[PDB]
With several copies, the nearest count.
Chain A
Amino acid sequence: RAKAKTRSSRAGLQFPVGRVHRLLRKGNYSERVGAGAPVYLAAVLEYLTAEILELAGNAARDNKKTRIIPRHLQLAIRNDEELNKLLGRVTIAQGGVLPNIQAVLLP
């Protein structure tokens, strides 16, 4: 037979299309799962991951750090209106809060 070529490599993705497919079939979502659905889902997940990781790496570099920590992730998410809206009701462990003091409290 032919050498095994992963669906991820066929779609130019880093996320596992086969695994996503299995999770869809066994997740009690529908009776049948189309061939394009795992590819699409994997691509979306990858894009979101890339966005967050890029912003966190930028925050780390601004903090003179070379490793991303929950603090950096929290900073990246809370400083972006859209990401904050998406992750509004989510608590990041060991993330802390954004530095914010009301103007009326300043001396």
Chain B
Amino acid sequence: SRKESYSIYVYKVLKQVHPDTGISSKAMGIMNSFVNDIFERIAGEASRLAHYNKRSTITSREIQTAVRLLLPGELAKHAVSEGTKAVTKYTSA
């Protein structure tokens, strides 16, 4: 039975920000729970927004608005910057 997790990607990010720093299994579990939680929060807010506006599609606008509503202050500002940059790069292949 294969059980998916965000361990690999969290580790990549860790190696990018702190090349010589590792992580314990407990801390990895914490990170996985955190990622799942934030995912749920954002997706749920986007879903509510879509329903409120009688739309059937969750788009980058919905994600952006959810981020602004949930993340406080500069967290939101930088998250929005990151998301926009990523979307632009993706759209330009």
Q: Give me the interface of A with B, judged by CB distance under 8 Å.
A: 7, 10-17, 19-20, 23-24, 27-34, 36-37, 39-54, 56-57, 60-61, 66-70, 72-73, 82-83, 85-87, 90, 92-94
Chain B contact residue count (CB 8 A cutoff):
59
Majority SS at the chain A contact face? helix
Q: Is the CB of A47 within 8 A of B79?
A: yes
Residues of A within 8 A of B90 (CB): 7, 10-11, 17, 36, 39
Tell me the complex Cα distance, A52–B86, Å.
20
Q: Give me the interface of B with A, judged by CB distance under 8 Å.
A: 4, 6, 9-10, 12-14, 16-18, 20-24, 26-27, 30-31, 34-35, 37-39, 42-44, 46-47, 50-51, 55-60, 62-64, 67, 70-75, 78-79, 82-87, 89-91, 93
Residues of A within 8 A of B22 (CB): 66-68
Residues of B within 8 A of A93 (CB): 26, 30
